[model samples]
Target: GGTMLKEILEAYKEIARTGNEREALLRAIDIVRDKYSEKGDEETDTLLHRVRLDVREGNLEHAVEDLKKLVEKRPELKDVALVLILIMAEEVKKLGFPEFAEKIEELVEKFAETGDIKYVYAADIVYLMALVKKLGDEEFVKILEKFYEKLLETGDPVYSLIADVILLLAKLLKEGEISEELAREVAELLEKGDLKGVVDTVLLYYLKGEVSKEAAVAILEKILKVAKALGDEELIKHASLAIEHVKMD
Candidate 1:
């Protein structure tokens, strides 16, 4: 788990650094493939090869064709599909196409039903979070309701509270106001954390007006501590931005 997590962290950093995510994906895929090539997994194996090729050729239609086939053929590989769809979403969104939002919601529902929350989070937290900004409020809330459901199934105490935080956020964004009931849930989640809850606590401030300056400082300070504690590049980067902006705010 730690090794795979490192690979994803590497992939994300490389993606941010170069803007060519496929470079990192190809490397990560080679490491993961381990070359056993079982019958149950060949479709995914084939999909990535073709998926990578089509994108380079400037004809994403073939890539989408392969992705659709994979979705219909092996719906069990939700993680594989999720990664592809997220990549596809980034590539397509510049052209103002909205086709992938439907599939994005479907994958969230699939994850909620039987998949692991770790894969969902590990896949791409930044892109997933960015989706909220780009989507219509109704559509965004609908997707997040599935995310709220999925997070509850995680069974980790911190995650359960984070689920409620998502609930609070979805409600705030949809209904255009934060009720104190949900606001208290956000504050309570802020209260408990040596670390697990630390990463997303910085996120609640995306809605800004609901939180206090005292509380904002507390969360930012904890994120700084945990960023160094975990020695994570991602956390450190976020911590830097949070503190940088909090001063200017």
Candidate 2:
């Protein structure tokens, strides 16, 4: 079993390096999946690999179908499932079927019914994406305001999920889904000393193209400071690039 897992890992590395080695990747993933029954660690690992490859290959329909089955079999994987659904939803929109993004809202509704905080948060993100795609900037501030309130109620410490939500919020703001007044409200929410809140506040202003170049540059500088304090190299890199953009004109 250990040897087989090693082989699967190596195969994944090869596929990563050689890109488009689908035949070899699928063969290796198949062996791993067969060795471990459905829902087993190895099976789940292989399934995710297959799903990633399928999406990359533009086989979203098959990927979504497999993801649905996997999530149904392992409800605990709702977070991962949401991420995959978001990926497929984006692809569907890019393929000129923005209406198909509605399918993700349905899935979000179903997951929200589970009443788990994680699923609830995931649902909010999925629903936000679907709405942003389908409705454009219409009523987006109201929708995000409600989601922000719900997030505050969770009282959970800063984590990856919150960080993801903040990133998405920043994206929405950049796309004009958030109004100036709404942005102020969002800043107020962040001033409460939450690390995620601080990160997101900087991100929101930094990405808001409506803001003047001078203002954007200032926000990016703040982002660099905060990211430095956190020691996040990725955040620092992102802030640097954003600063460069604002500086360009």
Candidate 3:
């Protein structure tokens, strides 16, 4: 029995590893489904696999429905719930359902109140989006500054969150929505070791005309190299544009 269960789990892992292979994924799902038919934790595993399959199959509506039922029955599956909700929220927004996205934000807040750090991270992103939509740039920057201050006080090594906030602040500064002094203050607060911090700082410095053309060119070239090494086409594009901007000036 244990051997069968292990084989089923291994099949599920294969599905995950080969998520883009539609037929193989479906075949794996069928194998797991037939191997574990009784309703229990194994059933929940099957439900999760089905959700992933539905998502990959472009069936967001079905995935959302099943995820809702799964989370309703198992509130302790908050991690899985967050992933499904975030995906549903993005898809709903893409489908022009802002109201559904708002509902998803409410769900994110509900999970955040449970005091799980992961949910707190998700809530921050959701809340940040809401704040950007509802507030003026000046007001948003003010709130974001205070938010980052509190985040830093938490002593958590959430480098990505810090980088996201810094990047947002840099964008606002570049748009003249925030003062350069404020931008420099936030930039100075960034951790030097973080890639995002390094990139954002370079962009801010270039925007402020604090870095020379030669220096800007050199920095952006390095950024492009890093982006390529990380296989981030978007980052590489951004770095290329930044280089062009430096060259033009």
Per-candidate RMSD, Å: 16.8, 17.2, 18.0
**Which residue pairs in candidate 3 have backbone atoms (N, alpha carbon, C) closer than 3 angstroms, thus clashing?**
none
After superposing candidate 2, which stretches have Cα over 4 Å from the reference? Answer: 1-5, 15-25, 36-53, 59-158, 174-176, 180-192, 195-249
Worst 10 residues of 3 by lDDT: 1-10
- Candidate 3: TM-score? 0.29
TM-score of each: 0.34, 0.31, 0.29
Tell me the lDDT of model 2 at 46: 71
Best by TM-score: 1
Q: Which digits, one per residue and each the tens of the lDDT, describe model 2 over residues 216-242? A: 554456546556656678767776766
State each model's CA lDDT, in order.
0.48, 0.51, 0.54
* lDDT digits (tens) for residues 1-249 of candidate 1: 233334444554566587775565455444334431454667566667776666656565466556655654564554454445455544545445354444454544444345554434422222333444454334333444454455445533233223334433544545445444434444444444434344354445544465545445545664565456455687677777776666556
- What shift in Å separates residue 245 of candidate 1 from its native position after superposition? 65
- Model 3 lDDT per residue over 1-249, tens place: 223434443554576576543443355445544443554567667686777678677776687667655654565544455555555554556555475477555655454345343443443434444445443444444444454455545534243254345446555655545456645654554434444555666677778767556655654565565466565676777777777777895
Ranking by lDDT: 3, 2, 1
195 Cα displacement, candidate 2 (Å): 9.3
Q: List the residue pairs that clash in candidate 1.
A: none
TM-score: the better of candidates 1 and 2: 1
| Positional deviation of residue 196's Cα in model 3 after best superposition, in angstroms | 57
Q: For each predicted model, how many residue pairs clash, with residues at least 3 apart or on different chains?
A: 0, 0, 0
* Model 1 stretches astray by more than 4 angstroms: 1-10, 28-41, 96-249
